[PDB]
Protein: Capsid protein
Amino acid sequence: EASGQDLVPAAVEQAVPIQPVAGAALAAPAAGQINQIDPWIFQNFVQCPLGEFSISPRNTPGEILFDLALGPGLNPYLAHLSAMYTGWVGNMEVQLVLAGNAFTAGKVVVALVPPYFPKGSLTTAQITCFPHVMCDVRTLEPIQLPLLDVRRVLWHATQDQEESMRLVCMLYTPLRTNSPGDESFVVSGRLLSKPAADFNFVYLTPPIERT
Amino acid sequence: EQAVPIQPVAGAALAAPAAGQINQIDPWIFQNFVQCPLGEFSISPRNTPGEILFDLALGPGLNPYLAHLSAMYTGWVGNMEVQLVLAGNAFTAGKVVVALVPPYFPKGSLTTAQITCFPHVMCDVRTLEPIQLPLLDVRRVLWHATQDQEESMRLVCMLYTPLRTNSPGDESFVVSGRLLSKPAADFNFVYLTPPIERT
Amino acid sequence: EQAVPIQPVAGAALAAPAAGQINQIDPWIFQNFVQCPLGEFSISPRNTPGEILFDLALGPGLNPYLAHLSAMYTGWVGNMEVQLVLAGNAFTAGKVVVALVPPYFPKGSLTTAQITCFPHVMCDVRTLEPIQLPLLDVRRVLWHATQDQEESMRLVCMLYTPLRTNSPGDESFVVSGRLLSKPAADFNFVYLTPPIERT
Amino acid sequence: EASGQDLVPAAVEQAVPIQPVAGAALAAPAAGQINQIDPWIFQNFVQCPLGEFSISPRNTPGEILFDLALGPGLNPYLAHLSAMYTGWVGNMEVQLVLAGNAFTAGKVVVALVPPYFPKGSLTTAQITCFPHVMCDVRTLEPIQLPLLDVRRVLWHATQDQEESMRLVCMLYTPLRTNSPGDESFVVSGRLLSKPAADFNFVYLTPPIERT
Amino acid sequence: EQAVPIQPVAGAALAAPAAGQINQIDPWIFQNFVQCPLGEFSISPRNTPGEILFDLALGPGLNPYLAHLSAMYTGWVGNMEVQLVLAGNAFTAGKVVVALVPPYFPKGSLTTAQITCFPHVMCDVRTLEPIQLPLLDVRRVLWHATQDQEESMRLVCMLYTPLRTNSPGDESFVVSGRLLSKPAADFNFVYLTPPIERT
Structure:
């Protein structure tokens, strides 16, 4: 309602307890070609294809706000390029935009659930067991956070049936508002992404039409 | 906030060898932001995201003084500098994205996702200071001719994240925005020409 | 804010001479605050002060990884480190006191006055940062045995000063709090032991 | 309603115009024993026995919010110890907690009325005549302030019929709120205390049951 | 006797760049040989040579402590170290061969001749000291995932040369053997993970 700093600009990146992860440097000597994507793609963030979501005051703590897996399907550019190659390596950088109204309150948690972890429940009791961050729905700045390619093999086939370290944001505390009149501000959260330092594809293929 | 993934666009240093003259502007014009003819909008709490708040292309028509001077020359070339102002108190919430579409782009609808793929900036409705950003003259020709509007770089302003405010019984508290512009450092006209009456 | 009238409690340096081994923990476990099993509450504007928001004793059961490791050892000893998070905007008012009761105390009701007599901290509901504080292992024995829950130091969280906020027609705007914990620098297990099936 | 600094964190201790006052150092050569209380009691503040009060928007300027006299009856620890001795000396330190909602407004005044002053009226016209402080009901930090033992004799008998420099907080301006909806936040104020540098008792006695 | 035609297999130094973490083990676990779940047999004078005395693959299931820890992580990688003990006096005769089959091998019968073609050791039944030998983690992937048993290197123990002893009227004097194991120097788990209940 105003430009004040009665919000929590918690752009602080709490040190996520995880080592760096090597990207395309591990798959280079195993790809028959030399491939490289447009450097300008590494420059600006861009909304993930499924990058929109919303938190309502009737959402229950534990509901999965989103759960998206690492892969080329997180950038429109990368998704478009993935139709030309067969395989991809590397990490990703994701910004979360949660700039709800100052009359709101509530907290969510974002976790880097590793591969091979059984999908499904991921209850609120165990969401904090993973390397995670606690975010307030009133944060001004976009929250940056990495998406590393914790993998068992050299690269993942561009047909992404593989297991990748998915990133899951879950509602931790109920969303409540504080304004005196007949309205609870549902907060609209967005998700931007861009490839990490050495994200890369491997082997050129005919750019299939119906990807 | 003036950090967009763009290269510096040369203007009036690329059109000099093929222009008869390179005419200058009253330097006072470089020191006053003037309201662009259609750079204004007003967001309402019921405005759905994805709407186009404003859309306007680079050219001497964005500035009344520049439009008046254009009637006296043959061609023009160079960049401009714009700034957006938003009227919102600290009790608001919502985002607006402003992108720089290239001067060759299939017109039509743009979803709230595509708008981020251009070199752009995202702006909260609680920003006090005017948001300044450049309007570069991307082109294939050397210098644009004044007497025919050809394709130029455009600013597009899309409602990114909807407005979240309270409002009294009246009148729903729109957040109004305006856009001002002025010539950049190297905006010049080309060839002095008798001003034809119907320009 | 981590200044409570308490002395540093020695752990795993006092139990070493009488322990067969002193087993260590995966250091990664020391670097992640995990949600305690019952460290959660939600204050309402009609919650009267003096209520117990949460109450929980020190032990390997406060951490899922520590609980899992406890099935592999005979005894444990050491301190832990906890932090409280509160979800409240700047338009709230009310205080919550968190005290460190010693590991021998007649259970029962505690008035809003007695709760301040323990080493404690008072916290407004408008605190952004997590409130960190230690959980020391005050004891009479050297190292606690894993297979029997004996008396340990407890954290008690009492609603000190009631909540003062507005609220829309729904749903009265509770202020929710959560409690996370992790092992301190000198939390160790004692004697490696085959994990019996029903632990 | 938010974590902003739209409040008055006036933890400033306006210089109360009063000299320091010697405590137990004056009664030591007149007590037959050597007595001393637990040092840990001097460490943390604790809510006074009668340390709770509340300000309502219907309270009138001039109403005595509280009026409490210096003595061992201001700490649960000191009150419990007072049953063992016969007499006490020394000063006290008192924190006042007035952290009302940001939509409130109003001011109170705290004064150190000396001994032998006639109890009763203490009208709003004269509350400022004493060494006093003006406090806003929206203060974040606890307001610290001393309670010196301005006395005529060496010590006061632990039966506190004596005259001690009582401390009196009175509502100075009416409490009004500013939020738009059908509610005036009554503010709950608290009072914590702890003994000063050389507060002390004198002579041990049988710890009477019904104190 | 720990000289088999094998190369040193790198573990946890090859899986580090692609693992989020590299978790360590209670060092005490490195200092106790524990009985493998099926590492036991008993040769009789009528046992024909060529029989499989035991056969067991590398993995965290060979050690109760390692099996318990596996429920807490995502992946594992590294080598192990095993030792065989035989109970035979000086009045016996007969040989037993222990081979290291690679982690990709058509299962089926193995004659007493093929068993020698692997990197192996031959052992008389009159050996007092435990026979120590490594179990390396030959693989194609970087680090094995804890929640799915994939192919790993196996130890196979075949009765090479039959037993030649006298025996009283009872009970024919079997020669019993047991197999113990423990983690090698660079056996690690990969990614700390909440222990799912049915692991």
Remarks:
- Chain C touches chain E through 17 residues (CB under 8 Å).
- Residues 1 and 121 of chain C are 8 Å apart (CA to CA).
- The first strand of chain C starts at residue 34 and ends at 43.
